Each structure stands twice: as C-alpha cells, then as structure tokens.
Amino acid sequence: GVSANLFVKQRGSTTALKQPKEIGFYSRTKDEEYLISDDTNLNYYYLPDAELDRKLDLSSGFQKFKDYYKDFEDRCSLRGLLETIESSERHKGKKINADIITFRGIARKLISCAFDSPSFNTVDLRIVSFNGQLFIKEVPEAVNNINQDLNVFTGYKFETLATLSNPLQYTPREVIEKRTKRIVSHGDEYISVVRTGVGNCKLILGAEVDCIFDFKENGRDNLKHYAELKCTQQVANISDTHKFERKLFRTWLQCFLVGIPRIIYGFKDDHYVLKTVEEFSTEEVPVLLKNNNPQVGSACLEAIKWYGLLTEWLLKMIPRDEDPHSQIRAFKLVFENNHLRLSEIEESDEEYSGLIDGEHILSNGFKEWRKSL
C-alpha cells in the first residue's frame, strides 16, 4: 500500500478554476430515495423586504422539526451522484471526462484544512480508484446543548420562511400565508451536479442547492439562477464583524467551488428572531474581504492555490487504471497533526470488503454500467 503525507502550509500556483457547468441534478426524498433529473425538492426564493419587520421567530416549530437525515442508513451516499453521472453517460454514450468525482462539501473541507484546525474541520474520507477516476466519500460522524440544536435548526427554519416549494407565479396566497407555520424538515434536498476543475485536474462535485432566485430555465444550465441561503448571528461590533468575515469566507468558498453567484444571509438576534437579510454576490466577496480584512481577503487566493496543490498531489500519489476490469484500490485520507495523511486500505482491514467488493463507495449499478462500456 501507498502512504503519503502533505503539509497544509504548502502553496501551489493555480489561481483560476474552470467555469463550472451543470451536467445534471437529482432530488433526494425524505425516505432515502433518489429521483434523477427531478426537481421536486427545488425551492424558489420569495422573501419581501417588508417581511423583515414582522419579527419572524426562527425558533418556532423546533419540537415538530423532522430530521429525516439523521435516520438515513447512508447519510453520505454517492449513489444519487453516480446515478446522475450514469444518466449523463447514457445520454452521451461515452465516459465523462473527469479525474475526481466527489461532493462539494468534501472538497470544501479539504480546502479548509489549510485554514482550520482538525478539531474544527474534521476530515475522514475514503478514496477509491475505479476506471481511472477517484471517488471520494466522507464517513459520517457515526456518533448517533439545547442552544447548539436551536442554532442548527434556525438555518432550516430560515430556509423554510424564505422559500416556496413552487414558483411565486404558481403559488396560491394561502400557501404563502401558512408558510410561517410550515413544518421544517431536514433530509429532502435538491442536488446539482457540476463539472469544474482546478489547474490540470477536472472535478465533478455535487452541491445541495437551496433555492432559485429569479427563474428556472427548463432544460438549460441554471447555475446563474441558484442562490445560497445561510443564517447567522447579527453583527453589533468589530469582533462580530471579523467572525462574520470568516463565516463569509467559508460560504464564498462553498459557492465559488460550484459557481453559485448569489449568497443570502439572515441575521438573527439572541432570541432567534430574524433581524435582517443581506445579499452578496460571490464574485465581489474576495474584494469586500480584502477591503475589510486583508488577512481573510488574501485567503481566497491562498485557498485556490492550496486547492490546486491538493488536487495535484492526490492525482499524483494515487495510481489510476483506465481499465474498468482492473483491480479497485481503496485509500483513507485524514487531516491530523497539521498534515493530510493518505494511506491505502489493506485487505486485512475490515473496511476493505465493503469498499472494494461492496456498495459503500460505489453502487453496483454504476460499476456494472462502467464495466459495460
């Protein structure tokens, strides 16, 4: 097995990313089912400015909040992503041109390894080499304060109070009126698959999209219409200004990796009441951060260089075989002791059987479709 260590303080030379292009989308139901090329869980933004003065409570409905995600058998499954990829394959008839296929959050955590401690950015990934491509999947926390639960709930509550299940032109007034008593659910999501790249590496990332801001073009790339909703504590002084700058840097990285051009923030108070909403464009965030906090502003270019270096190292140190019938290899990546540690999983390991000859990393249908090519 191969073993490698990389220092997160190293910087590369890449400064730009390939323009992200949507290649597909899918919707995950509340009972862990993947509907490919289906937008039943795509929401539409509608939150008038006049509603910010209604003193909306983000703590309401917490007791009836239904977290379907925590009950999922495979919370970090790649099955829907691979099914979307495979539908695109069958549409084109040819293997898609990519080197790393993973989720947007996995890449974001890998990049933030260079700016966050392991106690904050916990990274533990399984990388499998199949058909000349790297598939990366994060193993869940698997663990199975009231304030922390409320803080996590308030983001979903804000996304419920600021979005509609159908376009505003197709929504009756009674739905909008009863929106403030709607049940907040976690687990049913809409995910868009985006082909991008950094340096010489070409990636495919699945991003959970929150809402459509303006309108949806049927059968067309919709990245420029998507928005990213986030909720955060209200800022009242310069220390909270800096805290928000770090959070805004993280969100900018998340949106920049896939090309979401709009960011919306709900600022709430100590009583979980929505104080205000602010809109950012992901293109102007680096300049704003530079003008307000240069230390975080330069972190954007540092992050792009580190992202390119990380992808180059992963492609170099992981041997890839273009033959689908070749031997599948499994590796484990962990961010610890200020280093990214990559180690091949041996046959004696208990995880080898699941990853190599099981549907833990790759579903049976995807691998048999790839073999049939």
Binding site: A16, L17, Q19, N97, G197, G259, L301, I304
Partner: peptide, 16 residues
Amino acid sequence: DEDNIIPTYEVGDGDD
C-alpha cells in the same frame, strides 16, 4: 503582482 490577483473563472474545454 500577486497580492492584487482575484480568484476568477477560466474558460474550459466542453462538449456542446
């Protein structure tokens, strides 16, 4: 030379 560089997108090879 390098501090004033903003992360940007570049055109990439695509199919259709």
